[PDB]
Amino acid sequence: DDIRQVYYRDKGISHAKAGRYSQAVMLLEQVYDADAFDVDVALHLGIAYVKTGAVDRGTELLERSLADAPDNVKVATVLGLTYVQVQKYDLAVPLLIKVAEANPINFNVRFRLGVALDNLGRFDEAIDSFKIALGLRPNEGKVHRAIAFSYEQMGRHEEALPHFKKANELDEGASVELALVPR
């Protein structure tokens, strides 16, 4: 266990990458060290803790990791998305804002940001994120539906309506209009 410690590190990270998160916890717990901080071990063990229900230990390792490596978009993403999931929206929002700007092709982040903003009552900001998300994925019914709800809350029924109708059209399946549009 310098050699054994390298074995558990590499194997543990391997497991975390693969989604074998229980096993990743069992192995990376043997190598993690708060006071000789290794951000790859802490990030992957943080993820694995969050995925196995140890959300408080996980968000701890991830805050520590993000304090150590403020550049780490991977770390900021899982921490932001985790906070969204546990509904700590005051924490989630600034992380997701910063990740969305660092990584503008990440649709899930932009959507989840818009959903959070909507749930805080920041309907204008939500609408702005949902429009960005639709620019990434124009045929995601769930975004058309989310943005229609935000417009409606602001009394913008005229603007909501086309998005409502699109959401319901996409639920059924294919838009017949595309029969007439060249590719």
Q: Shortest Cβ distance from residue 7 to Mg ion (Å)? A: 49
Q: Shortest Cβ distance from residue 128 to Mg ion (Å)? A: 15
Q: Which positions lie near Mg ion, rule CB under 5 A?
A: 118
Q: Are 62 and 79 in contact (CB under 8 A)?
A: yes
- When the beta carbons of 46 and 114 are compared against Mg ion, the nearer one is 114
Query: Which amino acid belongs to residue 77?
Result: T
Q: Shortest Cβ distance from residue 8 to Mg ion (Å)? A: 45
- When the beta carbons of 21 and 151 are compared against Mg ion, the nearer one is 151
Q: Are 70 and 42 in contact (CB under 8 A)?
A: no
- When the beta carbons of 85 and 175 are compared against Mg ion, the nearer one is 85
CA distance 24 to 36: 19
- When the beta carbons of 32 and 130 are compared against Mg ion, the nearer one is 130
Minimal CB distance residue for Mg ion: 118
- The first and second tokens of residue 41, run together, are 């071990």
Q: Shortest Cβ distance from residue 149 to Mg ion (Å)? A: 5
Q: Are 141 and 170 in contact (CB under 8 A)?
A: yes
Alpha-helix residue ranges (DSSP H) falling in the chain: 3-18, 21-28, 39-51, 55-68, 73-85, 89-102, 107-119, 123-136, 141-153, 157-172
Q: Shortest Cβ distance from residue 92 to Mg ion (Å)? A: 15
CA distance 49 to 62: 10
- When the beta carbons of 16 and 116 are compared against Mg ion, the nearer one is 116
